[PDB]
Every structure is written in structure tokens, then in C-alpha cells.
Design a protein around this ligand. Structure first.
Ligand SMILES: Nc1nc2c(ncn2[C@H]2C[C@H](O)[C@@H](COP(=O)(O)OP(=O)(O)OP(=O)(O)O)O2)c(=O)[nH]1
Ligand SMILES: [Mg+2]
Ligand SMILES: [Mg+2]
Length: 539
DNA sequence: GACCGCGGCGCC
DNA sequence: AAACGGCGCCGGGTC
């Protein structure tokens, strides 16, 4: 492969090496390109970046993110990963893709640029006459790679000094719980060690072991088990509280302050485009799609995510999203009618569950209600439901009968999808995104029924993922015309940063864009809110 | 020091 | 734990 001097011509494929996996933190150790049987190895990578019209290759977005960090508007174009991920969503890493489709993922920039060339050719051949996947690539994923590059580069502002103060109060409160716990135990032990805790609960005290752990068969100390033991002993309550506080302290309060980038003074997630089986995104390195909200301390954490001074945050969340999508995919007249009447299923279940007026339903209850409703739908057992509702197997049985009885045509939709998946080996979204579910023909029932549950979930969760992705592609250009930013996506939610002056305008627009993104047999309602912080914005 | 599998748990 | 699904990150060992 011919070594040509550096500058590549128009349309050349890129290859690059990083010091570490995160583009906002990485040093650019090497940069190369390749077109028409040639390799160009940049002598100084950072300068060499100025020459490029676009990032075109494996992980184009990562290089575009790093380019944006350096003031360069190098947008991402073609990426063989995005092609492979639509061909098969188990195609998730370049190591795997390379091997599957005719190369080897190396550590040298040149070799990676040549890999990008030959992998694109092969994969692009695999997609000719795959009309719906080509549609998805050009009209959703490829433009989206650019939108995410801008989100990553921008980041979100975080109240550092606030969280540092919060850390010290939690540490005091944690210390009280461990000191209580040890006193009831009658001796000190590492309370973060679940093995030690097992012995204390089940051997040293006479507590009944509810469940075992999957891989190694140890007696489980899961919150579920511990809730079932709330009355057995006082120490349980303390353990549950200790578990909440240390989880949040070790995962959010302490790491996040130390992850502020020095140039930006902001927090930059990575939005992994080829990471899930359904077509959802994932967020990592810091994961900002799992920031706390539920518990009071979780909320105090969430409010640490704030706007730039002079700006406001704008949070938009699709209402009852996967239920609405389901009603379209199934055509359940009875279920459509619920959304045509503007009724909230999460509130109805909540009001019913706790036995209260709908106006009394709080967020805590509503969250519990979602578990009930999605759980049933996707195949939760009567056994579990009973404990989730905390009511008899007699009565919890009757719920899966009545819930399903209201809305037929779904089960008809479930059966159909599974039969199609048996026949063709995959299932698909409304836009023809595929997931191969080969264990539908599995001879072992537990493995078969697991596969089935994954199978009929995907079209629903994945269609919703496609809608949110599409809405993002359409919305992003309109935001930059308004001098507003797109900050985060949390599956069916978007978080925007708009200047106070234009904040309400952005909110109105972005709602209409999201609701009208692709009309269906049901109206896609969106809840929007505005605030100085993330918590206030959703309230 | 890097990485591993596990149990556990935050969010959607 | 439990026959909901989809994620990524945290705190007893190997090498
Ligand atoms: N299978 C399953 N899916 C969930 C669960 N929680 C959330 N999801 C999926 C389905 C939801 O529609 C979607 C978005 O989560 P949200 O918190 O926005 O819930 P949803 O939109 O249904 O209700 P909302 O009206 O927005 O509060 O993610 C769950 O516990 N199980
Ligand atoms: Mg929602
Ligand atoms: Mg949501």
C-alpha cells in the first residue's frame, strides 16, 4: 500500500490514535488517511487536522469531537461502524467488526485508515438494496453522529463547590449508619463487602435467606431481598439507607467534580452510537443517562446540573413513550382510544395501587407505577408482581389477566413478531432497524422465553429510539439558528441550553418538533419544563 | 498499575 | 430473588 506524502485528497478515509478512549481528554498521537490505494501519514497530527474537510472513517465522531475541542468544525461523515451496526446491532466494536468484515483493528493510524477504506467498501456492498437500512444510515445515524459530536464537545455545567459541600454531609450521615449497623452486628466489619454482610445477616443473625445469586450461588443481599426482610430486624433498614447513600456518594457526588474539563469548566459525556441491541444510545465515561432523581438525596444531586450564567436549561420528555409506540405497532383500538382521550396510564395505575386520587400521585409513586406497567407488558411473572404490588398472588394474577384483557391486538402483535422472528431470525422497528434473536428456536424453555422477551421488546424500545434520534436530527439545525445548544439525550428526553431571552421560544419550538417528528396513529405528547437546574426544569 | 467477574443498583 | 427490557459504573482476585 503506497506511502504518499501528507495532504490527502478530497474523500479520503481517516485513521487516528489516541492516548486514551475519551476524545475530550485524549492526546492525538497519530493521524493518517487513505484513498485509492495510498496511505498518507501526517508528520504533525494537530496541524494536519486543519487540512481535513471531514472526519470519514471508523469512529469519525471521536475525531470530530476532539477537533471541536481545538476550535475546528470538522464534522463526521461516513463510518463503517454505523453501517455494521445497522446490518447487525451486535456489531459494536471495531475489533469485532474488522475481524467479521475483512481486516484487523491495529494500534497504528495508517493501518486504521486503510482498514476504514476496505471495511467501508465491503459493508457498503452489503447494504445495496437494503433500502430501509440505507434510509436509516443517511437520514438518521450519519447526520446524528454530527449532532452527538457537538453535544459531547459542548458538555454540561456542574455546580462543583456545591457537590463538594454535599459530600461532607453525606459522609457524616454514612458514618452514623455504619456505626449503628456495627452496634447491632455487635462488631465492626466491612459493610461494603456483600460477602461479609451475607454472613452477618444469615449466619450470625437468624435471618431467612430469600434468594441465591446467579453465577456463584451465594445468598443474595439485594435490596429486593432486604425489603422482604424489613420487619425481620432493625439493622435491615440501616443497611438499605447505607446502600442508598454510598451508592450515590461513590458513583456521583465524588467522581463528577473531578471530571470537569479545564478549558471548558464543563462535564463531557460520550454518546455511544453503536452500543445497544435495540438502537438506543448509551452514555459513558461519565454516564449522564443515569443521574439520580428518585430519592431526596438523588434530587439534591440532580440540581447540581445547571445552566451557563444568563442561560436556562430546557428539559423535554416524551409522554408514556413506549406505550404510545406500541399502540401504533399493534393498532389496539382500545389502547389508541386511551391516548386519543389524553389519559395517563402511569397515573391511573399509581392512583389505583396506593388507593389515592390522581391529584395526590407523586413522582415516587408514578415511578413505581411504570415498573408495574412495562413489567407486565414485557413479560413479568405473577410471583414477582405480587411482591412489587405487595399483594396476594391471587390478586396479582388477576392483574395480568385484566391489563391484557383491556388491550388485545397486542398479544396478537406479540405472537406475530415472534413468528416473524422465528422465520427470518430477526425482529425490526417501524423503520426496519433489525435485531437478530437466534435463540427463539432454543430447545431449552428458559432460554427460549428469555429470547422471546428480548425479541418483542426491541421493535417498541427501538422504534422509540429511532423517533428520538430522528427528532434530534431535525431539531439540532433549528437550535443553532436560535443560538441554543443541545446538551443531553436520556432516551426519550432531551436537555437543551437556551439563553433566558430565547428560552421559552426554544421550548415551544422543540416541543412541536418532537411531537410532530413522525405522526402516528397516536399523538406524541411531550412534557417540557424550564429551569436554572435540571431538577427544576422537569418539575 | 490494569484488568476481571460478580453482585449490586443508578437511570430510561 | 422474582420469567419485564435496555444500559454503564461501583467496591475479592489475578497477573
Ligand atoms: N421495560 C422497561 N422499560 C422502561 C422502564 N422504565 C422506562 N422504560 C422505557 C419505557 C418508557 O416509555 C421509556 C421512557 O422512560 P420514561 O421515564 O420517560 O417513562 P415514560 O415515557 O413511559 O413515562 P413519562 O410519561 O415520560 O413519565 O423508557 C422499565 O422499568 N422497564
Ligand atoms: Mg417519557
Ligand atoms: Mg424519561
Amino acid at each position: 500500500l503506497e506511502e504518499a506524502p501528507w495532504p490527502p485528497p478530497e474523500g479520503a478515509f481517516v485513521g487516528f490514535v489516541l492516548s486514551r478512549k475519551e476524545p475530550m481528554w485524549a492526546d492525538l498521537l497519530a493521524l493518517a488517511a487513505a484513498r485509492g490505494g495510498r496511505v498518507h501519514r501526517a508528520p504533525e497530527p494537530y496541524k494536519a487536522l486543519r487540512d481535513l474537510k471531514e472526519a470519514r472513517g471508523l469512529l469519525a465522531k471521536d475525531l470530530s469531537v476532539l477537533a471541536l475541542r481545538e476550535g475546528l468544525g470538522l464534522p463526521p461523515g461516513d463510518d463503517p461502524m454505523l453501517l455494521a451496526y445497522l446490518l447487525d446491532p451486535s456489531n459494536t466494536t471495531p475489533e469485532g467488526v474488522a475481524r467479521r468484515y475483512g481486516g484487523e483493528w491495529t494500534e497504528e493510524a495508517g493501518e486504521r485508515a486503510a482498514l476504514s477504506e476496505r471495511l467501508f467498501a465491503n459493508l457498503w456492498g452489503r447494504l445495496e438494496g437494503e433500502e430501509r437500512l440505507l434510509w436509516l444510515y443517511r437520514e438518521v445515524e450519519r447526520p446524528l453522529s454530527a449532532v452527538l459530536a457537538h453535544m459531547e464537545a459542548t458538555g454540561v455545567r456542574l455546580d462543583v463547590a456545591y457537590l463538594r459541600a454535599l459530600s461532607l454531609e453525606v459522609a457524616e450521615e454514612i458514618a452514623r449508619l455504619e456505626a449503628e449497623v456495627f452496634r447491632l452486628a455487635g462488631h465492626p466489619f466491612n459493610l461494603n463487602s456483600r460477602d461479609q454482610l451475607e454472613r452477618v445477616l444469615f449466619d450470625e443473625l437468624g435471618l431467612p435467606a430469600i434468594g441465591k445469586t446467579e453465577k456463584t450461588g451465594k445468598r443474595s443481599t439485594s435490596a429486593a431481598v432486604l425489603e422482604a426482610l424489613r420487619e425481620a430486624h432493625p439493622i435491615v433498614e440501616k443497611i438499605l439507607q447505607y446502600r442508598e447513600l454510598t451508592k450515590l456518594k461513590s458513583t456521583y457526588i465524588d467522581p463528577l467534580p473531578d471530571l470537569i474539563h479545564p478549558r471548558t469548566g464543563r462535564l463531557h459525556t460520550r454518546f455511544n452510537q453503536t452500543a445497544t441491541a435495540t438502537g438506543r444510545l448509551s452514555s459513558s465515561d461519565p454516564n449522564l443517562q443515569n443521574i439520580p432523581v428518585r430519592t431526596p438525596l438523588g434530587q439534591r444531586i440532580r440540581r447540581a446540573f445547571i445552566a451557563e450564567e444568563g442561560w436556562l436549561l430546557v428539559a423535554l420528555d416524551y409522554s408514556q413513550i413506549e406505550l404510545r409506540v406500541l399502540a401504533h405497532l399493534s393498532g389496539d383500538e382500545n389502547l389508541i382510544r386511551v391516548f386519543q382521550e389524553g389519559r395517563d396510564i402511569h397515573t391511573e395505575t399509581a392512583s389505583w395501587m396506593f388507593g389515592v386520587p390522581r391529584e395526590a400521585v407523586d413522582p415516587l409513586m408514578r415511578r413505581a407505577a411504570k415498573t408495574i406497567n412495562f413489567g407486565v407488558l414485557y413479560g413479568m411473572s405473577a410471583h414477582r408482581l405480587s411482591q412489587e404490588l405487595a399483594i396476594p398472588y391471587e390478586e396479582a394474577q388477576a392483574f395480568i389477566e385484566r391489563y391484557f384483557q383491556s388491550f388485545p391486538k397486542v398479544r396478537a402483535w406479540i405472537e406475530k413478531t415472534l413468528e416473524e422472528g422465528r422465520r427470518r431470525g430477526y425482529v425490526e422497528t417501524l423503520f426496519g432497524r433489525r435485531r437478530y434473536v437466534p435463540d427463539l428456536e432454543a430447545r431449552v424453555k428458559s432460554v427460549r422465553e428469555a429470547a422471546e422477551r428480548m425479541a418483542f421488546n426491541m421493535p417498541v424500545q427501538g422504534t422509540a429510539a429511532d423517533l428520538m434520534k430522528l427528532a434530534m436530527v431535525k431539531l439540532f439545525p433549528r437550535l443553532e439558528e436560535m443560538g441554543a445548544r443541545m446538551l443531553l439525550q436520556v432516551h426519550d428526553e432531551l436537555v437543551l441550553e437556551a439563553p433566558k431571552e430565547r428560552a421559552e421560544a426554544v421550548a415551544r419550538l422543540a416541543k412541536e418538533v418532537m411531537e410532530g417528528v413522525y405522526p402516528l396513529a397516536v399523538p406524541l405528547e411531550v412534557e417540557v419544563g424550564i429551569g436554572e437546574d435540571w431538577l427544576s426544569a422537569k418539575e
